[PDB]
């Protein structure tokens, strides 16, 4: 299963 | 199943009452007492080869004393086989 | 283990030689 890559928006602040 | 019927005693305390009951049970039942004791013994016999050991040993004894006090069909061959199967347990 | 834990954050690149 290809790993779900959550978005940049959550990753980097602010 | 055989335990429910309370036909063959398995604890020494029940021997007195079970022995008295045999006297007034239909001869169609007393006839098959020989095969019942052996099957029940062979049942305990098999379960032994698989505390619990004391419990089976105690029940083994019970069947013998019952059969000893009961005059029934083929009591000769049956009472002997019952005693042998109890010796192998120990 | 019969309990699954997905963790795409820090894996090991299956398509590369090792460091």
């Amino acid at each position: 299963r290809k790993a779900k890559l959550l978005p940049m928006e959550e990753a980097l602040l602010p | 199943i055989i335990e429910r019927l309370k036909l063959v005693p398995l604890n020494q305390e029940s021997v007195e009452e079970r022995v008295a009951a045999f006297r007034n049970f239909s001869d169609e039942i007393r006839h098959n007492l020989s095969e019942v004791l052996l099957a029940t013994m062979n049942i305990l016999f098999t379960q032994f080869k698989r505390d619990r050991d004391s419990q089976l040993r105690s029940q083994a004894r019970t069947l013998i004393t019952f059969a000893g006090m009961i005059p029934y069909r083929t009591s000769g061959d049956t009472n002997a086989r019952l005693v042998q199967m109890e010796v192998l347990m120990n | 283990h019969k309990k699954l834990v997905i963790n795409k954050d820090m894996r090991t690149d299956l398509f590369s030689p090792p460091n």
Binding site: L6 | - | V5, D9, R11, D13
Partner: protein, 159 residues
């Protein structure tokens, strides 16, 4: 802890290049097969494979480094650096511990990447402060990857 059978299937399905490595800090191992990467928790008795196959060219190095402070959300515990023959790719990582005692690993995209150039990348190391240094088997040069949160008209997010 044996390598999962699915990794053996991929490894023996390798056309040109394969590689194994360790993320001992978080109890994870990884295997790269050509342009594909697979991570898994080796402490788990029947692990699931975290697959990452976005890469277009052969992977030549992989490493898990600390993040640059004040860049990512606090829940991002590490940065995953994936070097290929064409580019280096940064992925956000969150290795949060689980009730069983083995980190739960989830990956985040970053839009942070740079073209490799002419020098092979076979070694990646990270500093306490998140600095990323690169080297390889082409020469003795040492490169560094910079990255920042803000996009600028005169400067990219990753250099």
């Amino acid at each position: 802890h044996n390598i999962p059978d699915k990794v053996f299937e991929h490894l023996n399905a390798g056309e040109v290049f394969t590689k194994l490595g360790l993320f001992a800090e978080i109890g994870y191992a990884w295997a790269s097969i050509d342009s594909s990467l697979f991570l898994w928790d080796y402490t788990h008795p029947n692990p699931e494979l975290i697959g990452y196959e976005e890469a277009t060219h052969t992977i030549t190095a992989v490493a898990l480094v600390p993040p640059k402070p004040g860049v990512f959300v606090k829940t991002i515990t590490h940065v995953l650096v994936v070097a290929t023959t064409s580019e280096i790719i940064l992925l956000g990582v969150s290795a949060t511990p689980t009730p069983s005692g083995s980190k739960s690993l989830t990956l985040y995209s970053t839009r942070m990447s740079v073209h490799r150039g002419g020098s092979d990348v076979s070694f990646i190391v990270g500093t306490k402060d998140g600095r990323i240094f690169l080297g390889g088997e082409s020469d003795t040069d040492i490169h560094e990857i910079f990255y920042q949160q803000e996009e600028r008209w005169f400067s990219s997010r990753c250099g």
